[PDB]
PDB file of C-alpha atoms in Angstrom:
ATOM      1  CA  UNK A 159     101.506   0.065 110.938  1.00  0.00           C
ATOM      2  CA  UNK A 160     105.108   1.151 111.452  1.00  0.00           C
ATOM      3  CA  UNK A 161     105.362   1.735 107.699  1.00  0.00           C
ATOM      4  CA  UNK A 162     102.265   3.939 107.705  1.00  0.00           C
ATOM      5  CA  UNK A 163     103.605   5.906 110.679  1.00  0.00           C
ATOM      6  CA  UNK A 164     107.049   6.225 109.081  1.00  0.00           C
ATOM      7  CA  UNK A 165     105.589   7.449 105.784  1.00  0.00           C
ATOM      8  CA  UNK A 166     103.374  10.055 107.462  1.00  0.00           C
ATOM      9  CA  UNK A 167     106.077  11.297 109.836  1.00  0.00           C
ATOM     10  CA  UNK A 168     108.668  11.302 107.042  1.00  0.00           C
ATOM     11  CA  UNK A 169     106.477  13.514 104.861  1.00  0.00           C
ATOM     12  CA  UNK A 170     105.899  15.764 107.881  1.00  0.00           C
ATOM     13  CA  UNK A 171     109.635  15.924 108.630  1.00  0.00           C
ATOM     14  CA  UNK A 172     110.404  16.627 104.966  1.00  0.00           C
ATOM     15  CA  UNK A 173     108.117  19.646 104.986  1.00  0.00           C
ATOM     16  CA  UNK A 174     109.572  20.652 108.353  1.00  0.00           C
ATOM     17  CA  UNK A 175     113.152  20.476 107.024  1.00  0.00           C
ATOM     18  CA  UNK A 176     112.314  22.438 103.869  1.00  0.00           C
ATOM     19  CA  UNK A 177     110.829  25.075 106.178  1.00  0.00           C
ATOM     20  CA  UNK A 178     114.009  25.110 108.291  1.00  0.00           C
ATOM     21  CA  UNK A 179     116.191  25.679 105.215  1.00  0.00           C
ATOM     22  CA  UNK A 180     114.875  29.232 104.753  1.00  0.00           C
ATOM     23  CA  UNK A 181     115.749  30.114 108.351  1.00  0.00           C
ATOM     24  CA  UNK A 182     119.135  28.424 107.924  1.00  0.00           C
ATOM     25  CA  UNK A 183     119.931  30.651 104.929  1.00  0.00           C
ATOM     26  CA  UNK A 184     119.626  33.969 106.788  1.00  0.00           C
ATOM     27  CA  UNK A 185     118.456  34.874 110.290  1.00  0.00           C
ATOM     28  CA  UNK A 186     119.578  38.446 111.108  1.00  0.00           C
ATOM     29  CA  UNK A 187     120.108  40.309 107.831  1.00  0.00           C
ATOM     30  CA  UNK A 188     116.325  40.845 107.573  1.00  0.00           C
ATOM     31  CA  UNK A 189     116.171  43.319 110.454  1.00  0.00           C
ATOM     32  CA  UNK A 190     117.124  46.937 109.965  1.00  0.00           C
ATOM     33  CA  UNK A 191     120.191  48.452 111.644  1.00  0.00           C
ATOM     34  CA  UNK A 192     120.802  50.878 114.481  1.00  0.00           C
ATOM     35  CA  UNK A 193     120.673  54.661 114.101  1.00  0.00           C
ATOM     36  CA  UNK A 194     119.648  55.943 117.514  1.00  0.00           C
ATOM     37  CA  UNK A 195     119.968  59.627 118.369  1.00  0.00           C
ATOM     38  CA  UNK A 196     122.607  60.504 120.980  1.00  0.00           C
ATOM     39  CA  UNK A 197     125.602  62.806 121.673  1.00  0.00           C
ATOM     40  CA  UNK A 198     125.892  65.861 119.245  1.00  0.00           C
ATOM     41  CA  UNK A 199     126.840  68.044 122.258  1.00  0.00           C
ATOM     42  CA  UNK A 200     129.903  69.548 120.506  1.00  0.00           C
ATOM     43  CA  UNK A 201     127.842  71.094 117.701  1.00  0.00           C
ATOM     44  CA  UNK A 202     127.736  74.888 117.759  1.00  0.00           C
ATOM     45  CA  UNK A 203     124.913  77.184 118.877  1.00  0.00           C
ATOM     46  CA  UNK A 204     124.987  79.810 116.174  1.00  0.00           C
ATOM     47  CA  UNK A 205     124.020  77.644 113.256  1.00  0.00           C
ATOM     48  CA  UNK A 206     125.464  78.676 109.941  1.00  0.00           C
ATOM     49  CA  UNK A 207     121.811  79.102 108.893  1.00  0.00           C
ATOM     50  CA  UNK A 208     119.151  81.354 110.491  1.00  0.00           C
ATOM     51  CA  UNK A 209     116.928  78.446 111.646  1.00  0.00           C
ATOM     52  CA  UNK A 210     118.780  79.365 114.846  1.00  0.00           C
TER      53      UNK A 210
ATOM     54  CA  UNK B  58     136.407 125.895 130.161  1.00  0.00           C
ATOM     55  CA  UNK B  59     135.156 123.620 132.965  1.00  0.00           C
ATOM     56  CA  UNK B  60     132.100 122.539 130.949  1.00  0.00           C
ATOM     57  CA  UNK B  61     134.280 121.919 127.882  1.00  0.00           C
ATOM     58  CA  UNK B  62     136.682 119.645 129.762  1.00  0.00           C
ATOM     59  CA  UNK B  63     133.733 117.938 131.453  1.00  0.00           C
ATOM     60  CA  UNK B  64     132.161 117.426 128.019  1.00  0.00           C
ATOM     61  CA  UNK B  65     135.332 115.788 126.701  1.00  0.00           C
ATOM     62  CA  UNK B  66     135.513 113.460 129.701  1.00  0.00           C
ATOM     63  CA  UNK B  67     131.794 112.633 129.520  1.00  0.00           C
ATOM     64  CA  UNK B  68     131.985 111.970 125.778  1.00  0.00           C
ATOM     65  CA  UNK B  69     135.038 109.686 125.991  1.00  0.00           C
ATOM     66  CA  UNK B  70     133.215 107.861 128.773  1.00  0.00           C
ATOM     67  CA  UNK B  71     130.212 107.551 126.452  1.00  0.00           C
ATOM     68  CA  UNK B  72     132.364 106.065 123.684  1.00  0.00           C
ATOM     69  CA  UNK B  73     133.854 103.438 125.982  1.00  0.00           C
ATOM     70  CA  UNK B  74     130.450 102.641 127.526  1.00  0.00           C
ATOM     71  CA  UNK B  75     128.923 102.245 124.053  1.00  0.00           C
ATOM     72  CA  UNK B  76     131.773 100.001 122.905  1.00  0.00           C
ATOM     73  CA  UNK B  77     131.417  97.817 126.002  1.00  0.00           C
ATOM     74  CA  UNK B  78     127.648  97.731 125.440  1.00  0.00           C
ATOM     75  CA  UNK B  79     128.074  96.522 121.855  1.00  0.00           C
ATOM     76  CA  UNK B  80     130.656  93.922 122.905  1.00  0.00           C
ATOM     77  CA  UNK B  81     128.546  92.556 125.750  1.00  0.00           C
ATOM     78  CA  UNK B  82     125.353  92.585 123.659  1.00  0.00           C
ATOM     79  CA  UNK B  83     127.047  90.475 120.981  1.00  0.00           C
ATOM     80  CA  UNK B  84     128.339  88.149 123.704  1.00  0.00           C
ATOM     81  CA  UNK B  85     124.831  87.901 125.190  1.00  0.00           C
ATOM     82  CA  UNK B  86     123.343  87.038 121.796  1.00  0.00           C
ATOM     83  CA  UNK B  87     125.944  84.319 121.196  1.00  0.00           C
ATOM     84  CA  UNK B  88     125.385  82.922 124.698  1.00  0.00           C
ATOM     85  CA  UNK B  89     121.607  82.947 124.218  1.00  0.00           C
ATOM     86  CA  UNK B  90     121.965  80.989 120.977  1.00  0.00           C
ATOM     87  CA  UNK B  91     124.303  78.508 122.666  1.00  0.00           C
ATOM     88  CA  UNK B  92     122.060  77.961 125.692  1.00  0.00           C
ATOM     89  CA  UNK B  93     119.087  77.480 123.363  1.00  0.00           C
ATOM     90  CA  UNK B  94     121.175  74.791 121.659  1.00  0.00           C
ATOM     91  CA  UNK B  95     122.058  73.136 124.964  1.00  0.00           C
ATOM     92  CA  UNK B  96     118.459  73.258 126.212  1.00  0.00           C
ATOM     93  CA  UNK B  97     117.125  71.557 123.081  1.00  0.00           C
ATOM     94  CA  UNK B  98     119.970  69.029 123.262  1.00  0.00           C
ATOM     95  CA  UNK B  99     119.026  68.239 126.878  1.00  0.00           C
ATOM     96  CA  UNK B 100     115.467  67.751 125.640  1.00  0.00           C
ATOM     97  CA  UNK B 101     116.789  65.323 123.005  1.00  0.00           C
ATOM     98  CA  UNK B 102     118.620  63.423 125.706  1.00  0.00           C
ATOM     99  CA  UNK B 103     115.381  63.148 127.656  1.00  0.00           C
ATOM    100  CA  UNK B 104     113.271  61.656 124.829  1.00  0.00           C
ATOM    101  CA  UNK B 105     115.969  59.149 123.892  1.00  0.00           C
ATOM    102  CA  UNK B 106     116.336  58.166 127.559  1.00  0.00           C
ATOM    103  CA  UNK B 107     112.577  57.564 127.662  1.00  0.00           C
ATOM    104  CA  UNK B 108     112.792  55.413 124.534  1.00  0.00           C
ATOM    105  CA  UNK B 109     115.590  53.344 126.054  1.00  0.00           C
ATOM    106  CA  UNK B 110     113.714  52.765 129.297  1.00  0.00           C
ATOM    107  CA  UNK B 111     110.502  51.639 127.524  1.00  0.00           C
ATOM    108  CA  UNK B 112     112.407  49.357 125.140  1.00  0.00           C
ATOM    109  CA  UNK B 113     114.275  47.825 128.093  1.00  0.00           C
ATOM    110  CA  UNK B 114     110.988  47.233 129.903  1.00  0.00           C
TER     111      UNK B 114
END
């Protein structure tokens, strides 16, 4: 019985570990980066173009 | 004679008044453009603040 249980759980843990490997490789470089809008106060009012 | 001297004084006054009018009109236009810029910028600040408060929630 212990052998049956070990074989089943070992196969399960082998698939579990192969699944972990992908997460181990990278974990953050999949998300995009920050580019929020803020500041810009110092820019001038009479734009060099007429969309002012 | 009196009307001639009065005309000179009135006309020089006109020139200076016109020059001040042109100066101040250009200043007003520049200020209007700048306050438009600052108003829209304040609007930008508002939307981004809203985004931050919803994301934080």
